[PDB]
A paper describes a structure:
In this study, we focus on the MD of myosin VI, an unconventional myosin motor unique in its ability to walk ‘backwards’ towards actin filament pointed ends. Finally, by comparing the conformation of actin in the myosin VI-bound ADP and rigor state structures to bare filaments, we find that actin structural deformations accompany motor conformational changes during the force-generation cycle.
As we expected actin conformational changes to be subtle, we obtained a reconstruction of F-actin alone at 5.5 Å (right), as well as a corresponding MDFF model to control for error in micrograph pixel size calibration and differences in processing procedures with previously reported structures. Despite this preservation of filament architecture, the actin protomer adopts a unique conformation in each of the three states, with local deformations occurring at the actomyosin interface mediated by the D loop and, intriguingly, at distal lateral contacts in the interior of the filament mediating the interaction between the two strands of the actin filament. Consistent with what has previously been reported for myosin IIC and IE, this flexible loop also shifts upon myosin VI binding, orienting slightly towards the MD. Both the ADP and rigor states exhibit excursions of the D-loop relative to the unbound state, with a Cα RMSD of 1.0 Å in both cases. As we observe the conformation of the H-plug becomes increasingly deformed as the motor proceeds from ADP to rigor, with increasing RMSD relative to the ground-state of unbound actin, we speculate that this segment is adopting an increasingly unfavorable conformation as the binding affinity of the actomyosin interface increases, suggesting strain energy may be stored in the filament as the force generation cycle proceeds.
Residue numbers in the entry:
A (entry chain C), B (entry chain E), C (entry chain D): 5 to 371
The structure:
């Protein structure tokens, strides 16, 4: 009966049936093989633990994310993510639900084909559709115009949409955030003697990326007050007992979003990719792209944005033009709240790929 | 029919069929040749007396323990231990029982090979398995995680196990206790004029190590109250008639377990080997190694432990972490209660070495 | 007058004035307190012996290396290393020489500050500079491009440099070798019954790490010929009289450099850190990083490298690309031969920290 909205997270895969409030299942997408000798012999141990149990059994496994730089690294682990989610989380049969899957707008072909093809032949869903994650965040936002920011660990994208069409030549992909923000945080916590070399401990770094980080209002003046003796230093507690005190680096790591030079990436910041995508759109349409800048995803939830993002864009943009930055409550579930609206509406249900069409055309003509 | 659990004591060899309550036979493992001229001529005297009769015929023999510093000194005496136990104690035929043998985790190779090989070719058992003594104490404990302490006269070991695998690089071997505690007790009883120079009399020292010793709560303050006129002095009775009054040295000898400098050993105490083995294990796993410290063996049965061990570890360990020291009732039979659980369970019975495999591979591939 | 190049060894501190051939003084960096009771009463004994005399007075002391995991453990012993070297080895006055000190590229802050600050305030040098050990090995190598390997007991590093700039986001630190290779050698010599438990005896293990070890060409086939009766076994002689015969473990211990799983470290081998640091550098620059792989330090002097290192990298690297592994004669003095070239050249002498600047800025602005 009911359609299923399953979002192919970069993080953080999100799953829930059509409507209403939020995804029913969210989990960190990890598969982990056992890296220690089995001498206990109980045995009772699984061949590979998936999440969430692989986030409660850290250090006895070696966590490997299955999606890396926005591409699925191997479909052997990906299929196990899917199977684990459908059977032992959601508890639904594939033959009972038409599904809805997500992708990234600037991702290589035939990665959507191979995906679509494997999911139809392995799980035998009765119908399917694959949406780019940015378009769904417009439905979630409830605006009919604007530039969409889907930023997750680790693929960001910048898609401009105007009432009610998209401009093909204006889409910008930054590989700037967020797994590289995790790795950069791990490199600048070494500056205060906190060395987290192992795979498992890298998750702890990610947890400090959630809770303790913030973004500055003005870099130079936050760097100034960091030099002062005042308490920028916040004390985190670690599962083994250690108390970790981080200062400067706490606001330094997210600031990378405005200066990619810090992480050593040549590309221009969110600051400039916003401006340069708007100034690749037609003159008349720019008037309503200003004041319809819509952020989304989990990596836009740091405290110091959006009024940093606002002040930076407003400084580079032409004088005497109104700029408002639209940032929804609960951006982490934005894409999913999109998907729910889509699959419930008539009539584009009948633009979904159905099994009869798949039998005829296979991976051809997916576009 | 029934499998036999036979524990290769360092002491104190322990033997009993599979299940249930306790080993059927325990004995001090001594062989003794006759050190006096035979002029009685009855004769009727055995070429060498084994225990228990060699502990009732002391002084007419020279007792020689067959396992010394955790290694079997010669298999000529060891084979006589085995033969004596199977035939004139247990009263079982070797061809009727699959056996279960024990070893130490950090013991030289090919001492397990040579053992396995001699026992298969001499006693012709139909199947065999050799377990390290620490792993069996986990089965006895009924916990799935924790650091294991097998301390017997005279090899201790410290093995960390986490659900349900072992960490290879964290095993610590101290040669600190217990035959050196016997020898140290013999050296500090000389301080009160009790000189026990002969081999036989050394057993009497060992008996005073059992009954009269205790461990302090705080060394410095027990040393203080020893200087006081109050009765720390306890009167032991000796088989010849002598009444021996020991004071300070009564709590001094076990304290060596926390300060190896007293016996002149360079290595760090149980205090520090516990901490340093935990801080060689992964950060996430340390959280559940704290509060799963499991003691075992006969030399952990002194009265003043475990709350000395507790207070000392709790002082060196990081602040705000829960530490409980798990010390079973009847630790002297712990290993054996382990072995019983192992050989009764399916399926690792079919990971035992069988005669057909021994015919094919011999001492090769025992690992 | 003349500047002094003093290399802050992890081993093995190296010292010599500016130019020409080799360091004038090399020594094992040990401080040792006396672990036995002083009953001889001559007396004439020093409070603590430093090396070299602490390597001729082993067993009466407890040797403690002052640098542990690449960090200075306490500056009380470090200052005594420095004082001993300058006064009773080199025989130079601190006020007479501008000095040159070394560090590690991925080492916590403020460990270079605290060092610089203590050495300026304690020894009152008229000028100072602190170089990372890898950059100096490029000057020694005489190449203008390439990835630098500084591997000493016990911090390795992997720094890529291209004509004539460095790439910040490509530096990799492995804590894989070499004190852990010493400890691993001590753990696998126990497999042949050679138990070297004490601190002093650990030096003897280190000496067998120098002389008798080798690296395999192909692991699986060297493991095969080890199973054969052919003489891989080499006989070492020990200062007490013992003749030690080691076989398999002789080539097993260095092989850890290609498989960190053996020592239980989660990180990827030199094999993969070489490849993964090159494939984090820009596409155009990789062409000349291939064939400019430059090794350095004392722990790269084992016999079986570099043609193992070559064959392993050449197998993982893309097809049809020339790979040469540059390994200098006398790699143990490489860093120092670097330092000599640096301090002799104009003009970056005037980028050294001078006393006037230290008076003004102190430990601030060392970077």
């Amino acid at each position: 009966t009911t359609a299923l909205v399953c979002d192919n997270g970069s993080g953080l895969v999100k799953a829930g049936f059509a409507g209403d409030d939020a995804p029913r299942a969210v989990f960190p997408s990890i598969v982990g093989r056992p890296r220690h000798q089995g001498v206990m012999v109980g045995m009772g141990q699984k061949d590979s633990y998936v999440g969430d149990e692989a986030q409660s059994k850290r250090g006895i496994l070696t966590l490997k994310y299955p999606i890396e730089h926005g591409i699925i690294t191997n479909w052997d682990d990906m299929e196990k993510i899917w199977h684990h989610t459908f059977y032992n989380e959601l508890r639904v049969a594939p033959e009972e639900h038409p599904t809805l899957l997500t992708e990234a707008p600037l991702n290589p072909k035939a990665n959507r084909e191979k995906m679509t093809q494997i999911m139809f032949e392995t799980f035998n869903v009765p119908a399917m559709y694959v949406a780019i994650q940015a378009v769904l965040s417009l439905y979630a936002s409830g605006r009919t115009t604007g530039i969409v920011l889907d930023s997750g660990d680790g693929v960001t994208h910048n898609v401009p949409i105007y009432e009610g069409y998209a401009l093909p030549h204006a889409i910008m992909r930054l590989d700037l955030a967020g797994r590289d923000l995790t790795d950069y945080l791990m490199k600048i916590l070494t500056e205060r003697g906190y060395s987290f070399v192992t795979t498992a401990e890298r998750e702890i770094v990610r947890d400090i990326k959630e809770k303790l980080c913030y973004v500055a209002l003005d870099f130079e003046n936050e760097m100034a007050t960091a030099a002062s003796s005042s308490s920028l230093e916040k004390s985190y507690e670690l599962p083994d007992g250690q108390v970790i005190t981080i200062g400067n680096e706490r606001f330094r790591c997210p600031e990378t979003l405005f200066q990619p030079s810090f992480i050593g990436m040549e590309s221009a910041g969110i600051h400039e990719t916003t401006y340069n995508s708007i100034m690749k759109c037609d003159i008349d349409i720019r008037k309503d792209l200003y004041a319809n800048n819509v952020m989304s995803g989990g990596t836009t939830m740091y405290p110091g944005i959006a009024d940093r993002m606002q002040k930076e864009i407003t400084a580079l943009a032409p004088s005497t033009m109104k700029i408002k930055i639209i940032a929804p409550p609960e951006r982490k579930y934005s894409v999913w709240i999109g998907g729910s609206i889509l699959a419930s509406l008539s009539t584009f249900q009948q633009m979904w790929i159905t099994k009869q069409e798949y039998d005829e055309a296979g991976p051809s003509i997916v576009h």
